[PDB]
C-alpha cells in the first residue's frame, strides 16, 4: 500500500480515474507522467515500484517505455500493468514478448483493478 | 520506526558502528552481512525494507549487490544507501545509473546519517 | 526527401526516431545497428543525414563519427548525436570530432525538430 | 591459460564470475549472452571451459550442454552449470546431460574453486 505508483496516460481525464481507484484500494503513493518520455524522466530520479502504462500515446507509447524499462538495469524488473482499449491476440502476445507484467482493458473498475494488482503482487512475490 | 535493515560490509567494525548509530535514531531492527552473496542470501528469506552497504567488498561488492538487487521484481524500489569512502565524481554517477537510493562517505555521524535516511525516505514517500 | 540513416543496436530506439521522422513528415529512413554496419550502408551513397546513438559495440557513436569527417567522400554529412547524458566532457569531444549538433534521450518530436532545424538552418537547407 | 567462456544473459553475473576466476588465477576469460552466441563463440575455436547460466533467452543452459555434447569436436569439453536451485530434479537433468557439475547462486570464490578442482580431478586435468 506503501509502494510508489507512476501512472501514464496523455489524458488527465484517464490518469486521475486510476489514480482515485488507487486511492479507493488503499493505495495513496501515485504519481503521474504525460508519455513514455516524461515517465522515463521521472523514473531515472528513481524510487518507483509500480508503473501503469497506457498503451498509446505521443513521442513514445506504452509499448515503447515498457520495452525500454526492461532493458534498463536500474529499473529491468518493475512491474508494468499496460492499459488496453482492445485485448487484441497480437497485442496480448506482443505484451507478452516485450515482458509486461500484465493488461487490462478500460474501462475498468477498482474490482477489476484489483484483481490484476493481485495477480501480479502474487507472481512477483510481494 | 521498525523498518527492518540489513548493513553489509565485510569489516564487523564498521557493521556495528552503523548499527550503534541506527539504534541512536531509533531504529532498532537491523540485521547483519558480510559480503554481497552472504546479503543476497539473507535478502531471498524477505522481510527487509532498507539495505545500507560498503562499497569494497569481496565475492559481491556493493555496486554488484545494487544490481542484482534492483533486476529482481519484489526488490525493484528497495531502498539501497551506499557507503564510500570517497566521493569520486565517477563513483556517484554510476551509483545515480545503477539506481542507488543515495551514498554517505565514511567515517559519518548519526547526524549526517539521519540526514541521508529522511532525503531517501521524502524521496519513496515514507 | 531527405534519406536518413539511424544508427543503433538497441532496435526498440530506432523505430522511435524512425516514428518521430515520419511524424515529422521524413519518410526516406534506413537504419544500421551498429557503426560498422553504418558505414557499409554509407558507402552506396545517397545519404544526406544520419542520426546516431553514442555507446554501439564494434564501433561507437564518437568512433563512427570521426569517420566519416575523415572521409573525403562524405566529410561534410551531417550527424546528429544522441547521448544519454549531457556531460560537458562528451559535449566537448563531439564539438571536437565535428559532431552536426546532440540530443540528449528520451526525447520529444519537438526536441527533435529543434534539433534537425537548427542544423538546417546552419547549412542553409 | 585454460581459456573460459562465461555464459549468462545477465552481464552483471559474468563480470563477477569473471572476477572470480581473475581471483583464482584464470585471466584468459570471454562473455556470450545465450546458448547461441556462446555456440557462436565456441567456432572461433580454443576454448576449454564453459560455465554458463541455467536460465537464457534463445537458448537456455541445458540445450547449450545438450547441443555441446552432442557435438563430436566438443563432446569433451567441461560444462559447469549455474542455477538458482539445487531442484534434484535439475539435478537428475543435468546428470543425464553430462554436465561436469553445478553450483548455485550467489556463490563465493571458495565455493567456485572447491568446484573446479573437483572437475579437474575427476578429469584428470
Known sequence: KELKFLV????????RIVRNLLKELGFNNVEEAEDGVD???????????????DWNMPNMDGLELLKTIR?????????????????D?????????????????????AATLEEKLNKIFEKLGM
Not at 39 to 53: P, T
Not at 71 to 87: I, R
Not at 99 to 109: I, M, R
Open 71 to 87: 532493458a534498463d538495469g536500474a529499473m529491468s524488473a518493475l512491474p508494468v500493468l499496460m492499459v488496453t482499449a482492445e485485448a
Open 39 to 53: 515517465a522515463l524522466n521521472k523514473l531515472q530520479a528513481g524510487g518507483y515500484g509500480f508503473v501503469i502504462s
Open 89 to 109: 491476440a497480437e497485442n496480448i502476445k506482443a505484451l507478452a514478448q516485450a515482458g509486461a507484467s500484465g493488461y487490462v482493458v478500460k474501462p475498468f473498475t
Open 8 to 15: 501514464v496516460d496523455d489524458f488527465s481525464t484517464m490518469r
